Structure formats: structure tokens, C-alpha cells
Amino acid sequence: MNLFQTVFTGSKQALAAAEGIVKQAVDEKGRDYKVAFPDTAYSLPVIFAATGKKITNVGELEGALDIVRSLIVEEEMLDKLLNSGLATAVAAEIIEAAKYVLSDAPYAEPCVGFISDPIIRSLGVPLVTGDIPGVAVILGECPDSETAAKIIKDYQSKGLLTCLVGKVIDQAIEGKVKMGLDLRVIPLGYDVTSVIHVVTIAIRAALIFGGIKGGQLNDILKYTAERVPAFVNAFGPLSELVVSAGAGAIALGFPVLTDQVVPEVPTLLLTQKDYDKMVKTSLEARNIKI
Amino acid sequence: KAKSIDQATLQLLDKAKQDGVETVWDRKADMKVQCGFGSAGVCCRNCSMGPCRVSPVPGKGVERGICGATADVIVSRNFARMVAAGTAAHSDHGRSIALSLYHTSKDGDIKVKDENKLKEVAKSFNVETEGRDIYDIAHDVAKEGLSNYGKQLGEVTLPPSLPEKRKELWRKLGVYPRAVDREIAAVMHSTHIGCNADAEAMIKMSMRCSLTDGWMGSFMGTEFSDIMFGTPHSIDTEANLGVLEKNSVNVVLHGHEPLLSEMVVEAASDPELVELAKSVGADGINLCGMCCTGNEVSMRHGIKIAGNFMQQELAVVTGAVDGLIVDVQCIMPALAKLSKSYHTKFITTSPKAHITDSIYMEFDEENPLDSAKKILKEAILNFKNRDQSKVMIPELKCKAILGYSVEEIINKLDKVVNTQIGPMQTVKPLADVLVSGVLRGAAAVVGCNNPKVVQDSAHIETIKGLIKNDVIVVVTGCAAQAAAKYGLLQKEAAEKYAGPGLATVCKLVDIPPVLHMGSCVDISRILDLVGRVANLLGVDMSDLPVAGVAPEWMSEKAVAIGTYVVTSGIDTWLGVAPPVTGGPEVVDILTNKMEDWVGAKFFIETDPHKAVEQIVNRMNEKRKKLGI
Numbered sequence: 001m002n003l004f005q006t007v008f009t010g011s012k013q014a015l016a017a018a019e020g021i022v023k024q025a026v027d028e029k030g031r032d033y034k035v036a037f038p039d040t041a042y043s044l045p046v047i048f049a050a051t052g053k054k055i056t057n058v059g060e061l062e063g064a065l066d067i068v069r070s071l072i073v074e075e076e077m078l079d080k081l082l083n084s085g086l087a088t089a090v091a092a093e094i095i096e097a098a099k100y101v102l103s104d105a106p107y108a109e110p111c112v113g114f115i116s117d118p119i120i121r122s123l124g125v126p127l128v129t130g131d132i133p134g135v136a137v138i139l140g141e142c143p144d145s146e147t148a149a150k151i152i153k154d155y156q157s158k159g160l161l162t163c164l165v166g167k168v169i170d171q172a173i174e175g176k177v178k179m180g181l182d183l184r185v186i187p188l189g190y191d192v193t194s195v196i197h198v199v200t201i202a203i204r205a206a207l208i209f210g211g212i213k214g215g216q217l218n219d220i221l222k223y224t225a226e227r228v229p230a231f232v233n234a235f236g237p238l239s240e241l242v243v244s245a246g247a248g249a250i251a252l253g254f255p256v257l258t259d260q261v262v263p264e265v266p267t268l269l270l271t272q273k274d275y276d277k278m279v280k281t282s283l284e285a286r287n288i289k290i
Numbered sequence: 291k292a293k294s295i296d297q298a299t300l301q302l303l304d305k306a307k308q309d310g311v312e313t314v315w316d317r318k319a320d321m322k323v324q325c326g327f328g329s330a331g332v333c334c335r336n337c338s339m340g341p342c343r344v345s346p347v348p349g350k351g352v353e354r355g356i357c358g359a360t361a362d363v364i365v366s367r368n369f370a371r372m373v374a375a376g377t378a379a380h381s382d383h384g385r386s387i388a389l390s391l392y393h394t395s396k397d398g399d400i401k402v403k404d405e406n407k408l409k410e411v412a413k414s415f416n417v418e419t420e421g422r423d424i425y426d427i428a429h430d431v432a433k434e435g436l437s438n439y440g441k442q443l444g445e446v447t448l449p450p451s452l453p454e455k456r457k458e459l460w461r462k463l464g465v466y467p468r469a470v471d472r473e474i475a476a477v478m479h480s481t482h483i484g485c486n487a488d489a490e491a492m493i494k495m496s497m498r499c500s501l502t503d504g505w506m507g508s509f510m511g512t513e514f515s516d517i518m519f520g521t522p523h524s525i526d527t528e529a530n531l532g533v534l535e536k537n538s539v540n541v542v543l544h545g546h547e548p549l550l551s552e553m554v555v556e557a558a559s560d561p562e563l564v565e566l567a568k569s570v571g572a573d574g575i576n577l578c579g580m581c582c583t584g585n586e587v588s589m590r591h592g593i594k595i596a597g598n599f600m601q602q603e604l605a606v607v608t609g610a611v612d613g614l615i616v617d618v619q620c621i622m623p624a625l626a627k628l629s630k631s632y633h634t635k636f637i638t639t640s641p642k643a644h645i646t647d648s649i650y651m652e653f654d655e656e657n658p659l660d661s662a663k664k665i666l667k668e669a670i671l672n673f674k675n676r677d678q679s680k681v682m683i684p685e686l687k688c689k690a691i692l693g694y695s696v697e698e699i700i701n702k703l704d705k706v707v708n709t710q711i712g713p714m715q716t717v718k719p720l721a722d723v724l725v726s727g728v729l730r731g732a733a734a735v736v737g738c739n740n741p742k743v744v745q746d747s748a749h750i751e752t753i754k755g756l757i758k759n760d761v762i763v764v765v766t767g768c769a770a771q772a773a774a775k776y777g778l779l780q781k782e783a784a785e786k787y788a789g790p791g792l793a794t795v796c797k798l799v800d801i802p803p804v805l806h807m808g809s810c811v812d813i814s815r816i817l818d819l820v821g822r823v824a825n826l827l828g829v830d831m832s833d834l835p836v837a838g839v840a841p842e843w844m845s846e847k848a849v850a851i852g853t854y855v856v857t858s859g860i861d862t863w864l865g866v867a868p869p870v871t872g873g874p875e876v877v878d879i880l881t882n883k884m885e886d887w888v889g890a891k892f893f894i895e896t897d898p899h900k901a902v903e904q905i906v907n908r909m910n911e912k913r914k915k916l917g918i
């Protein structure tokens with residue numbers, strides 16, 4: 001299975017999970033039931049950026065699966081791969097929205113789940129200033145808790161805002177990493193779809209700071225690529241869904257670095273086994289100056 | 291039918307009609323319906339019992355020549371002789387280059403300009419370098435290269451980029467190359483009356499001969515030219531007939547051998563010659579190149595390219611060419627007649643290529659610079675005979691970027707290498723983009739023009755289709771010059787013609803979507819590149835999604851090139867049918883059975899859009915075989 005086929009398989013799995021969870025939400029709560037994220041002004045940010053539509057009820061959430069379906073075209077060209085990554089991102093957002101409408105408190109501490117607009121505005125000032133020179137999106141599991149803690153604290157000591165997805169949260173807790181918004185170590189959630197909660201940070205950064213109106217998807221992608229200094233460090237074995245989510249990060253212009261053997265793409269998808277050089281490799285790949 | 295897609299070409303054809311001079315198009319029209327027997331390759335003249343012609347349609351008419359040779363035998367022998375002639379042309383070019391290398395000296399006209407390249411080549415030839423004088427090394431390297439041409443005992447020396455698997459496959463098949471002249475002689479011997487009358491064996495002998503061109507003759511010529519005249523790097527130039535200057539002396543270098551054109555370029559900066567050009571009433575000296583010698587001087591110095599093969603006559607039709615200096619190969623003899631209608635001095639310089647009624651000034655290899663200065667002085671003095679009322683230079687020229695040797699490509703690829711990962715100075719970024727599928731493949735577009743095809747149409751259509759399908763294109767020769775004239779050799783072309791993956795790659799690496807890798811002998815560079823990629827991936831060259839295209843080929847050299855490209859394991863599309871349709875067995879060998887032998891085969895397709903589609907499908911199926 002080559003890179004394109006891996007991304008397409010991951011996007012289809014994300015679509016299947018989104019369809020299942022949306023069906024569950026339709027069964028339990030009804031199509032008139034409200035759909036929203038806590039304290040946001042852009043409804044579902046990824047769908048709002050891609051199309052301009054605001055998802056307000058469960059029926060509209062079910063109708064948003066058509067966006068995911070139309071974004072998956074299985075032809076081995078780079079544009080289709082980027083669109084398939086975006087389909088995975090939209091599907092992950094739909095899954096997170098369904099989680100919020102199904103459970104009153106989908107995320108428990110230390111996971112924070114969705115990040116509200118006021119937090120985005122608070123982080124915007126140090127973002128453009130340079131006190132936050134980048135965003136380290138750490139996903140998966142490191143071979144040890146010690147190495148995960150070392151990498152996370154290296155990013156933290158450099159001022160980067162690091163977000164954690166997956167078992168790396170538990171490894172960092174075992175590694176005595178101090179977490180919080182002021183400490184710039186944000187645990188999003190144990191599921192892969194929780195990575196969307198940092199993706200919407202970038203998307204809304206284009207909506208708030210950039211002033212790009214909803215539906216101008218190319219302008220949003222250009223803004224995230226040229227303004228948001230985010231990158232992905234994917235540790236541990238990578239499923240097709242993880243690779244598809246990484247394709248979404250690449251579509252947003254965010255390079256993906258991993259310790260796994262993957263079909264490398266220069267400046268976009270890079271393998272770095274040496275955990276002692278992962279921080280420097282990511283800073284170089286994202287062109288970050290400390 | 292239109293004669294060309296190039297507007298400057300069309301304007302000069304109108305001028306040639308007004309001036310009452312004949313062109314290659316006019317002679318093609320005069321030839322009318324060409325002989326069917328010769329077109330199918332079923333005519334034989336190998337002995338004076340003939341001429342013999344057998345039916346191109348099996349089961350009808352005369353079946354055998356007088357000696358009993360079948361249509362397949364006649365076709366296979368004709369094809370083999372074309373391969374032998376092409377191999378001879380390329381090998382003679384490389385032999386001259388090696389002899390020039392053998393005569394290099396510190397204080398002479400010919401020096402060593404790339405010592406690192408010479409040391410790497412010496413490593414490839416098992417020549418010691420440490421603690422040695424550079425010219426002693428150069429002479430030893432030249433001796434080894436010369437031995438490759440005529441050694442009768444032992445094995446020849448092949449470049450390290452050639453995969454071990456490909457060499458083992460050649461040895462098992464029986465096509466492993468011997469000395470170049472020995473293989474040419476073997477082909478000529480086996481086509482003699484009453485020798486080889488088996489099509490498969492004949493084709494295998496021709497493949498064996500073509501390998502000595504691709505991997506020994508052209509390769510050594512290219513690498514020694516780099517050693518003596520400098521490795522090409524990315525450089526700007528201008529292309530098409532508009533580069534001629536009305537108010538300057540115009541000196542057009544046509545041919546293939548680079549030593550003469552290098553010495554002419556050096557002589558053009560001589561203060562006495564510049565002063566002489568001023569004194570004859572010209573603003574200066576304007577050197578322009580055509581065909582492969584133009585490609586060489588343009589790759590290494592940015593000399594403007596006046597035009598490719600079927601434009602050579604039109605260069606004279608402008609009435610502005612004060613001197614036309616030619617060495618060997620692809621020099622239309624009609625030029626001698628044509629220059630009578632203008633003031634142009636048509637100067638032959640090589641004992642290998644005498645042309646009747648041209649001015650012969652033998653280029654002296656013993657004193658190359660002085661000889662080049664004398665020839666250039668004749669061209670400059672001819673400026674006084676210019677008739678400015680007969681001058682018409684089209685205001686059509688195009689910016690081009692070239693100089694993409696393998697070394698230059700590797701240097702460009704270093705830009706997209708993460709320093710914390712590495713390694714540097716490899717083809718690894720290219721291998722990565724090919725394996726990931728961001729690039730679907732790489733295609734080489736090579737070859738001449740041919741009056742049978744609208745000039746430059748097939749080259750341009752094939753190149754645009756390939757780059758639109760995210761296939762990166764490397765170009766050589768007259769195809770490269772067609773791309774230069776059209777405007778494809780530009781960074782802007784990436785966003786104008788390329789597909790998404792290739793546009794992203796071009797933006798990241800800062801290269802045009804079409805890479806000009808030099809002259810016809812510089813096709814060896816392409817081989818080198820492919821080999822490196824294969825050696826990096828641990829596979830044979832036949833496992834890669836690569837292809838070669840000759841949309842508008844005419845020469846025996848093109849036949850030899852396609853043969854050795856296929857024998858190396860690279861599928862080749864021919865835009866002009868070779869004279870083999872009369873032999874069904876030969877057609878079946880070249881287009882079907884060759885894949886069993888060497889993993890690649892010929893594709894005959896005269897429609898460029900269909901050729902692009904077939905190339906994409908073949909690359910995709912090879913990718914699926916490879917798992918990428």
C-alpha cells in the first residue's frame with residue numbers, strides 16, 4: 001500500500017467512523033437537536049472555512065458528511081491526496097461535534113478537548129509577537145515515557161506551544177511534565193480525532209487574525225501555511241487514519257515528522273528515528289527560529 | 291500541412307519562398323511518395339547479386355532475396371546497420387574527446403577545468419590520484435578511455451552508476467558490451483551476405499553494439515568534456531532565430547564536436563578580433579549555436595541558441611549570418627548551395643566532413659586556439675560583404691534556463707534536504723518524490739526534427755502532456771532546443787503547464803519543469819541519473835517509472851540511442867516509424883519480445899497525445915509492480 005492508498009484508506013475509515021457516530025446522534029437526540037462547540041463564534045471551524053456553512057442542528061451535521069464524501073477522490077495525484085487529508089479533517093471535526101452533542105462532558109482532565117475562541121485570542125498576541133515561535137503537535141506514543149518527556153520539555157523550554165494527542169499524554173504525565181495553557185502543554189484527547197482541536201486553532205487563526213471570510217478555503221490554507229508555525233511529530237506505529245490526518249496537516253502546510261518508516265516527501269513528510277535530534281529537525285522543517 | 295509551429299520559422303519560410311531558395315521542406319515535397327520497399331525495410335542492397343526487394347506483406351509476392359534471405363532477415367540487417375552507424379558517430383565523437391584529454395597540459399590550449407570531476411572519473415577507471423600531478427592523472431584516464439574503444443583482451447570499463455543487476459542481465463542475455471569499434475565491426479560483419487539470417491540474434495547483436503554507445507562512447511565523451519571544459523551548472527540563455535544581430539558580426543556554430551566551439555568562444559574575447567569586428571563596421575561579435583554544438587556551448591557558457599536541425603537553412607535565409615562554422619554530423623549539405631544566394635561563408639573544419647563547394651579551413655587540434663582565431667577572423671572579415679537590404683531577422687526569441695548536469699541536479703536537490711536528517715549530495719530527494727507518488731515518473735524527450743512531422747509540434751505536445759501529468763521531463767538535443775524556443779525552459783512554466791505535484795516540486799526545488807541536460811551524447815547523463823536512482827532503491831532500471839521519447843527522430847544516432855535506452859531497461863516511444871514494418875518478426879521482437887529480454891520495449895506511436903497516455907499507463911503499471 002503506497003502513500004496515496006494509505007491516505008485514501010484512512011479517509012474512508014474516518015468517513016465510516018463519522019457516519020456511525022452521526023447515526024448514533026440521530027438515533028439518540030434527533031435532527032432538530034442543537035450542534036455546537038463550547039464558546040466559539042464559527043460553529044464547526046473546518047466546515048465553516050471549507051464551505052461557509054454553519055452547522056447548528058444534528059440534521060445539518062448528518063448533511064455535512066457529503067463534504068467528506070466529495071473531498072475523497074481516489075486518483076493518485078497530489079491535489080487529490082491533499083483533498084483527502086482535508087476530508088479526514090472534516091470527518092474528525094464531525095466526530096468531535098457528535099461527541100459534544102452526545103455527552104455533556106466528553107473530555108475529562110487532563111484532556112481539554114475543544115479550545116474556545118477567547119483562548120485563541122489570548123494566544124494570538126504571543127503568537128505573532130514571537131514568544132510562541134511554533135506549535136508542536138505531538139501525536140502517538142514514544143518508546144519510553146522518558147523520551148516523550150524529554151522532547152516535550154525541550155519544546156516547552158523553547159517557548160513553543162505543544163499539544164498532545166494519544167498515549168503521549170500518559171507518558172508525559174509519567175514524565176512529570178507540567179501541563180496547562182500557561183505552561184504551554186495542552187492535552188487535547190486520547191483519540192486521533194482530537195488533533196482536529198489544534199487544527200481549528202490554525203483555521204480560526206485565519207478567521208480571526210487573518211480576516212479571511214468563511215468559504216475562502218484556498219485563502220485559509222495559504223494563511224495557515226505562511227503564518228501558523230505548526231508541525232506534527234507522530235510517534236509510534238501509524239495507522240492509515242493517522243497517515244490520513246497527517247495528509248490533512250500537510251494540506252494545511254504543516255510538515256509531518258515521524259520516527260516511523262514512511263514514504264518521505266521532502267519538506268512535508270520526514271522520518272527522523274533519532275529522538276535526540278527530533279526537536280532540531282522539526283524546527284528546521286518548520287523554519288522556526290528560537 | 292503546416293511546416294512548423296514556430297512563428298519565426300514560418301516568417302523565414304515566407305522569406306525563402308520570396309528569395310527563390312529551396313528548403314528541406316521543398317526537397318521533401320519534391321521526393322513525393324517515398325519508396326514503399328525502403329520505407330518498410332524490405333529492400334536489400336548488401337551484395338551485387340541484388341538489389342533485392344521482397345514483399346512487405348507476408349504470403350504475397352516475392353518472399354526471399356536472391357541469396358534466400360527472408361523479409362525478417364532483410365529488415366533485421368537494415369536495422370542493425372542503422373544502429374552500427376549511430377554507434378559509430380557517437381563513438382567517433384567520444385574518441386576525439388578522449389584524444390583531446392590525452393593532450394591536455396597546464397600551459398596548453400586545453401586544460402583541466404574540473405579537477406574534482408577528473409578525480410571521480412579516475413576512481414571509476416581505477417586510476418590512482420592521491421599525491422599525483424593533475425595532468426598525469428588526466429593522461430592515465432585518457433589512456434583507459436581510449437582502451438575502451440579498441441581493447442581485444444579483457445573486459446571494458448563501465449560507469450559505477452550502472453546497476454549490478456543490469457550488468458548480470460546483459461551477461462546472461464549475451465549482450466554484455468565489448469570494445470566499441472569491435473562491436474561496430476561485429477555488426478558490419480554479421481550483416482554481410484551469407485552470415486547472420488536470424489532476426490533475434492541480429493537484434494541482440496545490435497543491442498550489444500548500442501550499449502557501447504550509451505555507456506562507453508557517449509558517457510566518456512560527456513565526462514571528459516566536463517573535465518576539460520567545465521561541468522554545466524544552471525545558466526540563462528536565449529533561444530530561436532531572433533538572437534541574430536543586424537548590427538553585429540553573426541557567427542553560427544553548427545555540428546557536434548565541442549573543442550572547436552569552445553576555442554571559437556575563447557577566440558571571440560580576443561582583443562584583436564574584437565577590434566577587427568569594430569573596424570569592419572560591426573558593434574561586436576555575436577556567437578550563436580545550433581544543434582548539439584550549440585547545446586554544449588550554451589550549457590557551459592550561455593551562448594545563445596539560434597535553432598535546431600530543421601532551422602539550420604533558415605538561419606542563412608535571414609541574410610545576417612556572416613560565418614557558419616560546421617564540424618561534423620547533421621550538417622545539411624544543401625547549406626553549401628544555399629550560402630551561394632547570400633554572402634555567408636560556409637566553413638567546414640573537419641577532415642571527417644568535407645562538403646563540396648564549402649570553404650575548407652581544417653581545424654588544427656595541435657594549436658586549437660590559433661586555428662579557431664584564424665577561422666573566426668575569416669567570419670569577421672566577411673561582415674563587409676553583408677547586404678543589409680536582404681537582412682530580415684524575426685523579432686522572436688525566448689529566455690531559457692539550462693545547464694542541468696547530474697551534479698547540478700544534485701546541488702538543486704540539496705535545497706529540500708533537512709540538515710538534521712541528510713544525507714547531502716545524493717539523488718535521494720528525487721527518489722523520495724518518485725516513490726511517494728508526488729511525481730508519477732521521469733521521461734526523457736530526445737531526438738531530431740523530421741519533415742514527416744510538423745516541426746517541433748510532437749516535441750512540444752509530448753512535453754506539455756507529460757508535465758501536465760506530473761511527469762518530470764529531461765530534454766536533450768533538438769527536442770531540448772524546441773522546448774527552449776517554445777518557452778518551457780522557464781521557472782514560470784511550472785505554474786503555467788505542470789500538474790499539481792510537479793508544480794509543487796518545481797516550487798520547492800526552484801527548477802523549471804523541463805530540465806535541459808545537454809546534447810545528444812549528454813543522454814548518457816540521463817542514464818547516469820536513472821542508474822543512481824536505481825542504485826539508491828536497490829532495483830534494476832527496468833523497475834522504475836521512467837521512459838524515453840523520440841517524437842521527431844531522423845538520424846541513425848537516434849536509432850542507436852533508442853536501442854541502448856531500451857537495452858538499459860527503459861521503455862522508449864518513437865514518434866516516427868522506423869523501417870521495420872515489412873518484417874513481422876522484427877516488429878514483434880522490438881515491441882513485444884524485448885520486454886522478456888531486458889524488461890523494456892519499443893512503442894511506436896505517431897500521435898503525441900496517445901503517446902502521453904500510453905506513457906502514463908505504462909508508468910502506472912510499473913509503479914504497481916514496484917508497490918509505489
Ligand code: SF4
Nearest residue numbers: 334337340342355357
Ligand atoms: S544479401 Fe541476399 S537479399 Fe541482400 S542483395 Fe544480396 S542476394 Fe539480395
